[PDB]
Structure formats: C-alpha cells, structure tokens
C-alpha cells in the first residue's frame, strides 16, 4: 500500500516507532502524536524511495526533493531520519552506484574475520562510511557457507540454496542489484516409500495431519502444562513428541478396555437373564405336567377337581407370559451385543507404515533445524516463527555464490589467511593470522576494532582454533556452549538426461527405520541442467560423513532406481558430497536453539566485548571486539538474510562508536 508496504519490506511496523528508533529519536517518541506520524511518514517514504530503485544511492538531497509539504517543512528532521536509515543499513546497503565518490581520507581501521555474507555485508557498509576495512578469510574463496559447485554447465549449491520468500526479505533488494536467476519452487512433494511406490493420497494426508497435531500437542505441553524440565534437565522436542505419542497409544488401549468392559457387562446381564429363563422353563415344564394330569381326570368331576384344572391353567399362562417378556429382553441384549462386536475402536494408534511416514515429517523437521529433535529446545525451537517472510520460496539458478562474489567487489580481502589469535586492549587490537598453504608465514594486523564473524562451530572448537587474549568473558563462552550448531549435508547428482518429472521440484523418500529417517530423505529438482540434489539430515548427517562418496551415490541410485525404474536411471556424470561438520572453517551447517538455550543467547552472541583499562584508574574504555553472523541474529537465525542483516547491524554499531552517531 505504497509507503506502508515499504515499512513491511524493511521489517518495520508502518504505524509505530521501534525501540531502535526511540533511542535515536527520544524527543519524537516522548513528544506529541502528530510529530510521530510525520517521522513515520518520512521514514516510510525514504524507504519506499530506496526500495523502488536500489541500484543507485539515495542521497539526503534527493530524498528532500521528493517529499511534499507539510513533511518537507522540517529539513533537520528529514536529515536525521535519512542518516539513521543509512547508518543502520535500511537504505544504501548492498551493491549500488554511488553518486558521491568515496572520501580519500579514511577514518579508523577495522579487521573483519571471515568473508561470508555477514562479513562481506559489514565490510561494504564500513567502507561506505569511510573506514579502512580488511577481511581475513581462511578459504581460497569468499562466500563461506554460501558454497556453489560449478563444473561445465552444472551449477548446484552445497550450502545456501533457497531464498525463503521475498516478502520482508533484504535479499529482495539484493536480487534487483545482482542477477540472481530467482525461480519459484512449486510446493508439490510426493513421498515414495522404501519399496519405491508412492504413498496413497488418503494415507499421506492422514499422517501429515497427525504429525501437525502431535507438534501442536508438544506446544500445548510446553505452554499450558509447563512441561519444560524433567530430571533437572531441559525437555527436548524429541522427548516431548515421544511422551505425546505414548499418551496416544495409552488412549487407544484405554479405549479398547472400556469397549470390551462394556461387552462383559452386557454378557453378564445376559447370563443372569438366561439362568432366570432356564429356571423358569423348568418351572413351566413341571407345571404343564401337573395341568395335564389334572386335565386327564375325565368328567364328571367335583368342583375342587375342576378348580385344579383352571387354577393350573391360569398359573401356566402367567408363567408363559413372564418367559415371553424375558425372551423380548433376550432379543434386546443380543442385538445390543452384536452392535458393539460390529463397531470396535482402533486396533493401533499408528501402524508400521504410518510410523515410517511420520518419521519422514520428523526428518523434514531435523533438516530445518539441522539437528536431531532430541537436541532441540521444546519451548524455544520455533522462537523465530513470527518473522517468517511471505511469498514463494525461490531457487538461485545462477548459484548463490553470485551474491558474495558481487559483494566482494572493491574490498581488501586477504584469502588463504587463517586467523589464529585475536588480541584486544584499551589502546587497540591486533589479529594474528597465518598462510593456510604454509603455516610458518605469520601475519599481524593492527586495528581499532575487530569484527568476528567466525561460525558458531568454530567458536565452539575445543581445543580452540582461535585464541582470544584476554579470554572471552564467562557470559559469552557459556552462550557459545549452550547454543546448538547443527549439521546438514547435500549429495549433488549430475546426469546427461532428465529421467524425472520436470514439473515437480521436490520429492521425498521414506526410510525403513527411525534411525535412518534423515538419510537421503528429500530430493530437489531446481536447476536448468539435469541435476538432482539429495539431503542427509538428522542423525544420518554426522554418520554419513564417515562413508565414501561412491557408497553414498550408490544409495541415492538405489532409491532413484526404485522410484523411476532401473533402465531409466543412468550412472551420473559428476557427483559431489558435502561434509560440513568435517570442514574446519565451518564445523557444522547452522545454528539451532538447543535444549537449555533460548533466543536470548543469540542476543548474548551479538553483544560486543569491552577490554579492561591498561593502567589502573583509567576511564572506562570503548568496545573493541564485535560479533556478527547467523548465530548472532535472534529473529533470523540460520539464514543468508540473517547473516546479511547481522553484518549491517554491526557496521552501524561500529560506525556509531568510532565515527560518532548521526
């Protein structure tokens, strides 16, 4: 809706001021309501202007010209708003043609550890603000966990693969700046069982609904019943699902017991009736003989003998009446018995096949969080749900590496440079690194500040790859320990021809066991060339890194042969298997909210370190060691856009500190 949509696209509420804005505009937010709406319009309009053409720099002068009265009345307010948006990277981020060339004199010096998207994004901003910036990268390439495989015409992504909706995504801006061949991924995803045949539509929908009901139940368990500690240990999502599943199995058995208990009660009531009818039949039989003996006394007869015949006649019809009423009651209970024998409750909660298909949905959850469900925090695993972007998910058909390569343009990047030690003091920092090709070649970089974008996996290493001097404080290291760093791998299969449905972008494979539910569980058809990409998720991810490529490719072919037939599936021309946990510069795939952790730990990862004073009694020094990366952004963890946004955040915090605010 014009300006309101610009707010949405920048992850801002159009109709109110954020916490970050309140800090920079305390006069406005504590002031009258009318002035707030002017601020909000100026903000929303400036964002719209930037978003309509993000290929060129939006200057303050250009912004003020395109505003109308009474909003362009106050010029300092427009200047303050524009400067805020530029500093925090809401406008003039990414790759754009600069109107005013960069000032030759550079102010301050920053070392950025790592040239992934978080590092690259921060670097561009800091250079754009007029700082001297150098990136130290251990790999022989930029991009980090954005890692694209390229051989001939084959282009597949072993790391980041998918833009998860453009609605609110800063990668929407980057896609207008860089040629990413964005291609919508169609949602249709047929599951194929272990044998190779499709799951029937009736069963597929039944299990998926039950999976979501099970998930909903774990959330109910967490928030309503407060089932979050068990044996002084935090409850995982895996535990909770196990407990929920067990309670459904309990109910199935309780339901059977109550049904069969109703049958015995009916059968005992019938037994009591039949005994009464057998005793009555015997009383009728005896009474019939007495009537027959009395009746065979031929007339003429006295009145007592006549009475005897008629007395016994009356008594016999009275007993024959009772037996007829009891035979009606026999008929009522016999049909009431037959209805309960006809309509029993369920035999099982879930069969072997249902439970297998249910494990696929669990594996899909283990892919999403890059970890076994036994590691996920029950309460907080889905804490970032509210900030999900709207729209279709998209493939990057150019290969996602096109983004970091473009972001690296015009930046001082030292490749093959492994940081070994980070020293930070009140007077400055020095970063000590080596050449990865020959470890004896040592380098020393001196700077005013360090931005650490090392992956959480690297920060977790024991014994450490990177030493901090002085050591990081307990509040930082405990957060590092608490946070999860998952694993997820990809098998790329390049063929000479398409043997699969070209209109279906993805299809599942259901594993035989729970143990192997993540193993090659999901296939992707995303690229122009004939490429299939299979995922190894869950517990399989870690285990499958110790198995060779030939065996892994064999297991993929085995599965694909089962689905499309042996003659249809040729041997692939090129193959690649990722091993992200064994990668020493990643040590895993991406972060997750582990049991015992929360969203607050992401905020702790983001908090910069301030060293002690050099001389005792010297004034409180400024912060020196800053942190960015997917593991540092609470609302967008484990993503490219999260990394991107975290870099923009730290460039602003660093610029505010060393260039001064506004």
């Amino acid at each position: 809706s014009g300006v309101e949509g610009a707010a949405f696209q920048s992850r801002l509420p159009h109709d109110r001021m954020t916490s970050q804005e309140a800090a920079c505009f305390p006069d406005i937010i504590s002031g009258p309501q009318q002035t707030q709406k002017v601020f909000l319009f100026i903000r929303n309009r400036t964002l719209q202007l930037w978003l309509d053409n993000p290929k060129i720099q939006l200057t303050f002068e250009a912004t003020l010209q395109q505003l109308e009265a009474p909003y362009n009345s106050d010029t300092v307010l427009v200047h303050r708003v524009h400067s805020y948006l530029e500093r925090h990277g809401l406008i003039n981020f990414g790759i754009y043609k600069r109107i005013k060339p960069l000032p030759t004199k550079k102010t301050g010096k920053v070392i950025i550890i790592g040239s992934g998207v978080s590092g690259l994004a921060a670097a561009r901003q800091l250079q754009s603000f007029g700082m001297d910036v150098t990136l130290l990268e251990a790999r022989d390439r930029v991009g980090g966990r954005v890692a694209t495989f390229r051989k001939g015409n084959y282009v597949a992504d072993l790391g980041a693969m998918v833009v998860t909706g453009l609605g609110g995504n800063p990668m929407a801006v980057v896609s207008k700046q860089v040629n990413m061949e964005l291609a919508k991924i169609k949602q249709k995803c047929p599951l194929y069982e272990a044998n190779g045949q499709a799951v029937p539509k009736e069963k597929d929908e039944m299990v998926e609904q039950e999976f979501n009901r099970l998930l909903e139940a774990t959330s109910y368990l967490s928030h309503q019943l407060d089932f979050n500690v068990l044996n002084n240990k935090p409850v995982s999502l895996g535990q909770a699902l196990e407990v929920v599943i067990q309670l459904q199995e309990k109910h199935v058995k309780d339901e059977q017991i109550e049904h069969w208990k109703k049958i015995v009660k009916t059968q005992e009531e019938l037994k009591e009736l039949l005994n009464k009818m057998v005793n009555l039949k015997e009383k009728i039989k005896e009474l019939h003989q007495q009537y027959k003996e009395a009746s065979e006394v031929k007339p003429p007869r006295d009145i007592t003998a006549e009475f005897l015949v008629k007395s016994k006649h009356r008594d016999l019809t009275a007993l024959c009446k009772e037996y007829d009423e009891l035979a009606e009651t026999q008929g009522k209970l016999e049909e009431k018995l037959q209805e309960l024998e006809a309509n029993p409750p369920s035999d099982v909660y879930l069969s072997s096949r249902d439970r297998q298909i249910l494990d696929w949905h669990f594996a899909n959850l283990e892919f999403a969080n890059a970890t076994p469900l036994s590691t996920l925090s029950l309460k907080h695993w889905d804490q970032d749900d509210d900030f999900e972007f709207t729209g279709s998910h998209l493939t990057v058909r150019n290969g996602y590496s096109c983004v970091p390569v473009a972001l690296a343009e015009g930046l001082d990047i030292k490749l093959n440079t492994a940081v070994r030690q980070v020293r930070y003091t009140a007077s400055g920092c020095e970063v000590i690194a080596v050449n990865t090709r020959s470890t004896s070649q040592t380098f020393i970089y001196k700077c005013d500040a360090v931005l650490c974008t090392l992956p959480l996996g690297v920060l977790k290493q024991q014994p450490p790859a990177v030493q901090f001097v002085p050591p990081l404080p307990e509040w930082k290291t405990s957060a590092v320990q608490r946070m999860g760093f998952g694993n997820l791998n990809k098998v790329v299969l390049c063929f000479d021809r398409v043997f699969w449905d070209p209109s279906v972008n993805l299809f599942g494979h259901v594993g035989s066991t729970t143990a192997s539910r993540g193993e090659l569980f999901l296939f992707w058809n995303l690229y122009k060339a004939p490429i299939l990409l299979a995922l190894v998720a869950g517990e399989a991810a870690g285990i499958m890194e110790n198995i060779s490529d030939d065996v892994i490719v064999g297991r993929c072919l085995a599965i694909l042969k089962g689905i499309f037939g042996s003659s249809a599936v040729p041997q692939p021309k090129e193959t690649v298997v990722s091993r992200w946990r064994a990668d020493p510069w990643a040590r895993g795939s991406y972060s997750y909210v582990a049991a015992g952790s929360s969203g607050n730990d992401y905020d702790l990862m983001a908090q910069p370190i301030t060293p002690g004073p050099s001389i005792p009694g010297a004034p409180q020094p400024i912060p020196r060691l800053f942190f960015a990366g997917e593991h540092t952004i609470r609302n967008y963890p484990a993503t490219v856009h999260g990394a991107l946004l975290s870099g923009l955040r730290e460039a602003g915090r660093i610029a505010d500190q060393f260039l001064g605010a506004m």
């Binding site: 139940a217 999403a368 997750y592």
Partner: peptide
C-alpha cells in the same frame, strides 16, 4: 529452523 522448510511446511504450534 522452521522457516527453512520448503517442502511440507509444518503448521503445528505456529500462530
């Protein structure tokens, strides 16, 4: 996390 899911997006427990 959950936001990563492209195929068969889980709905249970989301608002």
């Amino acid at each position: 996390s959950r936001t990563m899911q492209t195929a068969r997006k889980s709905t249970g427990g989301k608002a």
